[PDB]
Design a protein around this ligand. Structure first.
Ligand SMILES: [Ca+2]
Ligand SMILES: [Ca+2]
Ligand SMILES: [Zn+2]
Length: 307
């Protein structure tokens, strides 16, 4: 598994002090136990931009709808494989109470099914250029990122499964906010290629878009980086595949060990089955009705997701 949304804090501090200051300011300013975090289901209008250079990349509506279903299961703890969560970690599992719905009104007020399809001469898209997010670079412009979650689906290449933009970048880069997913790994079963065939590449990416970091701290394997979530055990490097429970490492060397089945690890889709309650608090805090960076998304979410 490969994702382009690392936050290697040691590297950022050494090379980009303004970015480092923005992240530390971000972490100092989060108020998880605020009275103005909504208690109700948070509704997210989604628009999926299919950007395709061949027929394989022009994935079906059924395939896209299955991804929306997977997001609703994972973000509402309605995933059947929650039965796989070790009992030692089950008391920490969270229900984000976030719902996703394809948009039914586009930004100019036209009716839509929430899926855009754009043909392109670009053979492979680059995370560095973010070219998939711009019509003039062969991709497709984002839809008002204060009101829609944009999910681009394209050919990212054999190595990258997806990438997201973090919320601390929203103020400086609002037009590229959203998530990009490799077309081979979008939706559940169907055209999705094993072992990333259960729609978890988007769950993981959407977690980044909702302020979560890789559980091991993007620190090359050390015990020094953090994901800023206390209820995710300190972890060395990423886990891949599907380890056996319990897996201990040099950072958490006692049972129940590391939470390799967390969506924010790098394990196979079928190996993942939970967010924690700490991760859920972080995600929902973005919708704080007083200071939540994504609070405007709830104002017209109902109108934008009704035909
Ligand atoms: Ca942690
Ligand atoms: Ca680590
Ligand atoms: Zn990631």
């Amino acid at each position: 598994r490969t994702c382009g949304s690392e936050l290697n804090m040691e590297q950022i501090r050494r090379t980009e002090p303004l970015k480092y200051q923005r992240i530390t300011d971000w972490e100092n300013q989060i108020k998880l136990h605020s009275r103005s975090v909504p208690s109700s289901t948070i509704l997210i209008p989604v628009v999926v931009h299919v950007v395709y250079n061949n027929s394989a990349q022009n994935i079906s509506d059924a395939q896209i709808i299955s991804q929306i279903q997977v997001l609703n299961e994972d973000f509402r703890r309605m995933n059947a494989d929650q039965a796989n969560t070790p009992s030692a970690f089950a008391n920490l599992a969270g229900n984000a109470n976030i719902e996703f719905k394809l948009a039914r009104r586009d930004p100019n007020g036209n009716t839509t099914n929430g899926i855009t399809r754009t043909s392109t001469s670009t053979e492979t898209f680059s995370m560095e250029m973010d070219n998939v997010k711009f019509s003039n670079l062969g991709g497709n412009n984002a839809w008002n990122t204060r009101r829609y979650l944009n999910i681009w689906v394209c050919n990212l290449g054999d190595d990258l499964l997806g990438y997201a933009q973090f919320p601390f970048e929203f103020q400086t880069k609002p037009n590229t906010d959203g998530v990009v997913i490799h077309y081979k790994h979008f939706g559940r079963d169907g055209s999705a290629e094993s072992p990333y065939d259960k729609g978890r590449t988007a769950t993981h990416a959407v977690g980044h878009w909702l302020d979560l970091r890789h559980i091991w701290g993007d620190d090359g394997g050390s015990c020094s980086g953090t994901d800023n979530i206390a209820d995710t055990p300190n972890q060395g490097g990423y886990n891949e595949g599907c380890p056996s429970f319990p897996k201990t490492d040099h950072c958490t060397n006692t049972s129940p060990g590391v939470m390799f089945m967390n969506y924010m690890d790098y394990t196979y889709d079928a190996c993942m089955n939970l967010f924690t309650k700490g991760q859920v608090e972080r995600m929902r805090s973005l919708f704080d009705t007083q200071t939540g960076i994504r609070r405007e998304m709830q104002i017209y979410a109902n109108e934008l997701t009704n035909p």
